[PDB]
Amino acid sequence: TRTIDRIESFFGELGFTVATGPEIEDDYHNFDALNIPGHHPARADHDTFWFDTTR
Amino acid sequence: SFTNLKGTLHDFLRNFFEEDLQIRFRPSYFPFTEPSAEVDVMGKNGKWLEVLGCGMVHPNVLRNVGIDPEVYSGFAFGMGMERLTMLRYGVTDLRSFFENDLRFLKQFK
């Protein structure tokens, strides 16, 4: 947490705003749109926890 | 640009550690960036540890979300907080951030 605040501190100064994400996420956002997509080492390689076929 | 990325990053490393090298402005691969790179610190306990990845944004990604690659560029990074931390204060086994021993925690007051 010290390290996060610390980073936010450094970065706030340059303008950067703070966004967030939901932690339980979908195919589309964690990979697909991020140019992965489905058949790309990434998926299994990232050592991924799936809930079902997109959650 | 990239110089922007390399620059922004140096600055942030020059601040996050207070000049405890070594560092690596080193090349990498993320399908969401191109070119992309990684930093990797050493600070002993042995081998280099990855602590962030980064790249100029892959033109696919930009268009993928309604931004014209022909008019905007960008950069992105992904920092690993605990290995940042681990390095910074000299924690060994990183696994011991979520075991949450009061004795471990207390020295971080």
Next chain:
Amino acid sequence: RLAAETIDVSLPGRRIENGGLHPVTRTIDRIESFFGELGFTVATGPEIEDDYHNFDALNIPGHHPARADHDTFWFDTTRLLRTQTSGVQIRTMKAQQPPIRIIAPGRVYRNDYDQTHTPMFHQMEGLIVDTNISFTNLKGTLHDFLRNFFEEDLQIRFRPSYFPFTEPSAEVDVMGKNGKWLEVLGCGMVHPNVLRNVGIDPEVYSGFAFGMGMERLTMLRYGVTDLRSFFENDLRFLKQFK
């Protein structure tokens, strides 16, 4: 036991009452955050100052109605009590060549005590100098600041004014039901005299500088009728700014 050992959960818990900051401190904080993210480094100066740094370096110099106009407390020909946190503007610029960028909160001193005047009070200087900076930016940045400051409730104006160490100068005056128009901050482009005597080339760099009265910002925002209440420190008063 689970019945027989019930307690009244609405009884007040144990703790000491919380302790907020004083309203000007609260204002200072907000502002430093606002400017924190534009990259303005925070800088201090002594509150006991000389004939050079308050006044003569800021292109007063001596035979200027200013010295008297700021109802100055002197200690002798030379030592005075800060009149403005415009000292640090000179003090900073003399220690580093540009691409500067700084605020500078402190407590200046005058000689008036009135509904909207005090023999002490606090100011926020801002300075920025680099081959780049203009009037539109001064206007741009202050508009932008006021917006966040008040959140846009209050009726402002942005006029011409006069400061021997700017040119063009400007003031913003804010109206808050009374009153009416209150001088809130004052600003301009850094007078080239003031760039020269401090060692920066005016032909290469330009800058804008400003100084806002904290207690005035603080009154208007939380509508304090009387600026002089800020230093009587009635706990009743302070506590409403927890």
Next chain:
Amino acid sequence: PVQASLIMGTHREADLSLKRVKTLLNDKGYQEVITYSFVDPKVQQMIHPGVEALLLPSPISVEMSAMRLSLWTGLLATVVYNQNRQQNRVRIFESGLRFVPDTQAPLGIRQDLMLAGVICGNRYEEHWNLAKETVDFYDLKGDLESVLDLTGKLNEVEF
């Protein structure tokens, strides 16, 4: 708006925040005040008998004619202000600089930044469970230990 570089500023982790100390102080139930830096010497002299001060020729008033040697004269003036009013029990702090005449300082005075506070009256004010005891030195001592660099050191502290 202004076109500029987004360079970082040079932070140092080992340095402590006043703003942080005030929070710790507020969390302990001290309220912040700001007092006028020029106090009355007839009284300062009472608290700091002899050690004397940078008087001010042609002041606003004679009560406001001496630069503070410390935060105490303004601090105790605030607790009387309120105690006269007729709210006893006041516990406040202030940061600010004092002004001690030093020949080997720039101009004749040593403006140091101090942190100062008073507490008095009861510990935990008027409550259905809590002990209505009047404040004592170990309360302040404790408040000071938490301020004290249990926010940095601590441990080379000696009283």
Next chain:
Amino acid sequence: MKFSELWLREWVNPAIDSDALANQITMAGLEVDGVEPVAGSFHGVVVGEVVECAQHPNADKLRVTKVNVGGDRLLDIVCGAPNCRQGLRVAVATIGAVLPGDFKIKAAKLRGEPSEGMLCSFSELGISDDHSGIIELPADAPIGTDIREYLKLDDNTIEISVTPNRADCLGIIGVARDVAVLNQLPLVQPEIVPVGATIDDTLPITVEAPEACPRYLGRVVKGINVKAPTPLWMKEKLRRCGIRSIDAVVDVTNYVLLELGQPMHAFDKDRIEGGIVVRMAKEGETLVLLDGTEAKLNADTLVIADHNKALAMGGIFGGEHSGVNDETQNVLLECAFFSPLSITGRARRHGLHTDASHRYERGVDPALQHKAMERATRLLIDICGGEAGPVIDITNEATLPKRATITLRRSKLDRLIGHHIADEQVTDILRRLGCEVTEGKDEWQAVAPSWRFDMEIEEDLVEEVARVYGYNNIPDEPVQASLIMGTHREADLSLKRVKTLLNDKGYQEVITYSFVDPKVQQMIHPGVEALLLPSPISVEMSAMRLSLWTGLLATVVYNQNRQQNRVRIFESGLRFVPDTQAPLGIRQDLMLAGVICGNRYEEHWNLAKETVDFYDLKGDLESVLDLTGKLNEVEFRAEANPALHPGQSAAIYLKGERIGFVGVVHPELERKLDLNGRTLVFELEWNKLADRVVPQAREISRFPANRRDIAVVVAENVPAADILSECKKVGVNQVVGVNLFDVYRGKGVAEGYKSLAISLILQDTSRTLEEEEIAATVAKCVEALKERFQASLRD
């Protein structure tokens, strides 16, 4: 993978440190993460022949023996690793040398038998894992030189991680070529001479689905000695790249692999029926693999098959049948290319990850097969017996991977790097990488080499120019941007601020796994359906949390076990609560949680050693929530929440709506494995209390105020919050202060009732309040107090 420095220097040899090389490859974007000598260190170990291996014995399993080096006088040594044969050319430590595990060659008889001086075996030299014992060299060694020099032992295996892109670095060649490109140097390639067939026209090989296997090379090689002994140099390049030297045929396919990137495989013609069919597997067609087990094959999985059964998965793995065995006479060499998107899924589907799968899934050069076929043919007939046969080349013009023309603008490059790399130095870096480039005014045309699977678009092409020019020497400049502030809101309250306040009320911040013991959190929340994690790191870490209450009570017990309970922790982070009305199926709400237990303070000279109770938590959160947010509006209604004591537990409100819970955990749940002494716990729905009142100054009043105490009698079934909160409403203009200062019960108060001494302070802005006016406005309260409730006398 892993490679052997001196085999790379064979292909390209910079004049630079061993250490400099490693650093230079890692800045090429493939991180070297290991460097090992290949043996331990030693001197005075030399090749020599035993010319005579006398009997013995007189010590049973030992042979006495005259051995010979170069500096003559024949050397007499004793040996008994029992493959100590007559004429062997052998590795020998001489009278004074020193072996790893630093031990000292001396001269002493062994069993009265001749003295000194040990013959060596791989193990005793630092290259681990024994063969039989006693190293057996390939005849014609330098009958007297150092084995360090002969066996090229001043060498490191150097282990690297290679990112899925740029699949051209998984043989030695690719890596060599990338290192070459860095040092401007040319890449010295071994002379690979085509073999020229000498037997039958052979073998019906049809590809049923070409798009998945464009190019297939096959070559039957008749009557080869299977148990030939893989010659040391091949045993030693193969072993220095992390491959147990298994076999003979199998080793050469491994050798070509490591050398060229190409995954070969060999078969048994005399088990293959009516030709090979390279085809997609029928859905559920089983195939018993090289390791006992079959596999149910889904209809997207290419198999190397025969005319009525399946033999081996497509560029993945073999067959407990169709491979090389004990009486294999003849073989067919597979050397093919496969479309990586027809390999990708499959291996792991079944849980295989072989050398071949790996290169095949990210792309082996489809211009490599011929060359790899010819090295693997020459290398088989040299090492094993047998002769040649026609290379059966069944390719596919079309589905053969199609290299693409990239065009790269001087601008885009300058606009994405932000640093000018001279026109003249980008063309080279591009050509030397492998491309065919035409410079063309403000732009370049590059044709992607066949072996590079990650050059498809312009930006891919600039990775490369940056990559090679050197990140080291791309300068740092800071980003130039507008200074706009972005929108602040004084009314919102940072969690940072709360974390601080919380931890000034003595509270350690904690971070907990968001997934937990499902078994465990049922005791906390009784069978409240939890979002289910099928296939997690553990059964005990398989539920997404609905409180932190689980993570936290888990965290007390943790330290409780380390002898020391007296724990005060809080945590922030989200709960995951299943909702078919959420975005996706889970409500993801930010939360604030904490737990306190044990002694109010630790061992102190002048603080009571009472343990901690409900109001200690209530005050702690009365601190947070409030006089930081707004307060005066929130309330603590009593409520049952399964896993906390009903009598001592409350829901926290805040104009109307639940914002949380606080309580001492229920007894049997504390006993439920969970540890010692009563524990207090709270959770707050953060987003609901992430917002505070911006103040407005309100007049003061220089009139003195007046205190008026009242003794309010009232049934034990009446909250005391409510009585108070009811006076400052009948309040108006004005009773300014209400305060509960006592609660009394028993003697002189009706049993089951209870008195609340209350003190209202009255102040006015207009006038200094009248003696009568006072009694009046208390009476307004006292009367409204017996509006609701009842009233009001003694204690």
